[PDB]
């Protein structure tokens, strides 16, 4: 004995980035990873006159790999691996609230949200090396646009749990990013040196519809 | 006879009352 | 594990 | 891409009204539509919208008038408010939603006198 | 039901200055406020979507920043085309609210 029911309500999506930089082994001129990270997040807002606490992971996929290589002596710079995402690539966002419209998304019929755009941009990070000029790698931005939602469960033995995700698609924005003493060409994307700008968050404001099976 | 080719089994685009299904 | 995505009123499965 | 309103234009107090926002260029499975008024002498203010898949976001102050439903066929969408009064008095469009709640296209507008 | 509100109700300018229009938010509305146009005998065109991003068929003498409860809207040659009625919106909450609305005069 069965229904089906509406929840159209408000949403407000607060994420960041992460990073990893590691050095390889030697005298100290080489560098070896600069790369993404996944990140969580835990905010408070109010819909209706009522506060919901909520949760956010991000992470990424489709990321586009570079590399410089300076010479071939012990004292040359070379970083062996920096990523970048740009137009071919996704941001994945996951979600979970407070609310009782939370605890109704287990049989779902359809699901759809008009999300706003925000963009982000990047900042600036130092290669430091030991005798010399330090050269910084500098600028960058991308905007995200939205795409589905997708529900999956996961059944193992103890108890089942379930995760929402929210889909991404990119779009290269000025300023280009470069590397300074080098000769690397003024290239579009944002790269994982310093991504989130020295920001406490991202934000990105809509509306969400969802239709599901509920008990009666 | 309609939109979409899916036209009792609710009021949605896609239900029936077929591109995609069985 | 079961997805499901949701493009256009119609549900896109994978197991 | 077009939007086209027709309605009566002069109608009696106190009773029905019947507008219809007939769209071209694109599907109403896909995009979703926006209602709009200004009176004379006024700011625009925001009467409904109505989802891709059939579903409607009213006015908390004109909930108990109005009702927005579509036809995907004929490829149109039509609005209702009953219970008229001289203060409704004003010209009526129909938009067309891109992001959130940005207004992208516009229609032509009808005026209702009363 | 946040309220936006315009100060001024007319503006004047000569065939070629800056013009500056400002609306103020009551709660904090963070960067989403759109620009539009209504020229007489027409319908409202949209020009600035977010607070400061411009639409594609946009001439370039249009631009606005702001952020917060602030926003402003800037015109760096004025033309005889530019007489219109100008509107800041509110894109944050459930309800979308307008302005006031600001008429610019040719002086």
């Known amino acids: 004995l069965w229904k089906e029911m509406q929840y159209n309500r408000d949403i407000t999506i607060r994420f960041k980035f992460a990073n990893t930089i590691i050095k390889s082994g030697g005298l100290g001129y080489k560098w070896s990873e600069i790369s993404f990270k996944p990140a969580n997040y835990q905010y408070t807002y109010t819909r209706d006159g009522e506060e919901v606490t909520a949760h956010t992971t991000c992470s990424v996929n489709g990321v586009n790999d570079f590399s410089f290589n300076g010479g071939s002596l012990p004292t040359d710079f070379v970083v062996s691996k920096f990523e970048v995402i740009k137009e071919n690539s996704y941001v994945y966002i996951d979600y979970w609230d407070d609310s009782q419209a939370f605890r109704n998304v287990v049989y779902v019929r359809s699901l759809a949200a008009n999300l706003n755009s925000v963009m982000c941009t990047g900042g600036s990070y130092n290669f430091s090396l030991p005798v010399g000029q330090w050269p910084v790698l500098t600028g960058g931005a991308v905007s995200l646009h939205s795409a589905g939602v997708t529900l999956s469960t996961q059944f193992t033995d103890f108890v089942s749990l379930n995760s929402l995700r929210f889909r991404f698609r990119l779009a290269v924005e000025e300023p280009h990013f470069k590397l300074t003493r080098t000769r690397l060409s003024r290239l579009y994307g944002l790269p994982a040196a310093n991504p989130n700008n020295g920001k406490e968050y991202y934000e990105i404001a809509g509306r969400f519809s969802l239709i599901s099976l509920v008990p009666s | 006879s309609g939109g979409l080719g899916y036209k009792n089994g609710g009021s949605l685009p896609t239900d029936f009352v077929l591109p995609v299904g069985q | 594990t079961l997805s499901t995505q949701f493009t256009d009123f119609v549900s896109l499965n994978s197991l | 891409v077009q939007l086209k309103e027709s309605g009566p234009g002069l109608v009696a107090p106190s009773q029905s009204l019947s507008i219809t926002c007939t769209v071209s260029?694109?599907?109403?499975?896909?995009?979703?539509v926006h209602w709009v008024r200004q009176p004379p002498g006024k700011g625009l203010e925001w009467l409904g919208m109505?989802?891709?898949?059939?579903?409607?976001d009213y006015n908390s102050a004109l909930k108990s008038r109005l009702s927005i439903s579509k036809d995907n066929s004929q490829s149109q969408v039509f609005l209702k408010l009953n219970s008229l009064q001289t203060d409704d008095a004003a010209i009526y469009y129909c938009?067309?939603?891109?992001?959130?709640?940005?207004?992208?296209?516009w229609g032509q507008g009808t005026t209702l006198t009363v | 039901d946040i309220v936006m509100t315009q100060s001024h109700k007319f503006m004047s300018t000569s065939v070629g200055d800056r013009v500056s229009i400002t609306c103020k938010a009551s709660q904090d509305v963070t960067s989403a406020v759109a620009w539009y146009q209504q020229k007489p005998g027409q319908s409202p065109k949209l020009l600035i979507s977010?607070?400061?991003y411009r639409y594609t068929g946009v001439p370039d003498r249009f631009s606005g920043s702001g952020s917060g409860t602030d926003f402003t809207f800037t015109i760096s040659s004025v033309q005889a085309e530019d007489l219109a009625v100008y509107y800041c919106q509110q894109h944050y909450s459930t309800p979308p609210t307008f302005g006031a609305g600001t008429k610019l005069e040719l002086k």
């Open positions: 977010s607070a400061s």
């Open positions: 109505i989802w891709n898949g059939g579903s409607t």
């Open positions: 260029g694109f599907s109403l499975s896909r995009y979703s």
């Open positions: 938009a067309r939603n891109s992001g959130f709640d940005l207004f992208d296209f």
